[PDB]
Design a protein around this ligand. Structure first.
Ligand SMILES: [Cl-]
Length: 129
């Protein structure tokens, strides 16, 4: 009988379950308090991708590599100055990727779109995840 799931694993699982209904394959979380709620990472720069199959990947800059391994030992990390574009550019299509349209700015979103692959579509999702 195993060690119980962390609350962060449980929150991710609940978001993963919300994805079918929002008609997306993955969610890109860029609002920091949302990333903290879903992962435990308390730093000031991150991006976080949660997939339908329950896997996840988290990104942060070089100042936080040690801390993210310590605070988030259950998600593989990617170092990047520009976190969200770097996670997105690593996705191989086809994939519908939701984003927090209530929180990303028009120009932050235009920057993301540049990094998306030829069959990765970004989908505006409203609400606090
Ligand atoms: Cl817990």
């Amino acid at each position: 009988a195993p060690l119980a799931d962390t609350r962060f694993l449980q929150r991710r699982r609940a978001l993963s379950a919300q994805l079918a209904a929002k008609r997306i394959d993955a969610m890109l979380v860029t609002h920091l308090t949302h990333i903290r709620y879903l992962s435990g990472f308390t730093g000031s720069n991150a991006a976080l991708i949660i997939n339908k199959d329950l896997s996840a990947r988290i990104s942060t800059d070089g100042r936080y590599i040690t801390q993210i391994a310590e605070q988030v030992p259950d998600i593989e990390s990617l170092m990047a100055r520009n976190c969200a574009p770097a996670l997105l550019s690593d996705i191989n299509g086809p994939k519908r990727v939701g984003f927090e349209a209530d929180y990303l700015s028009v120009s932050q979103c235009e920057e993301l779109r540049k990094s998306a692959g030829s069959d990765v579509e970004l989908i505006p999702v409203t609400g606090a995840i």
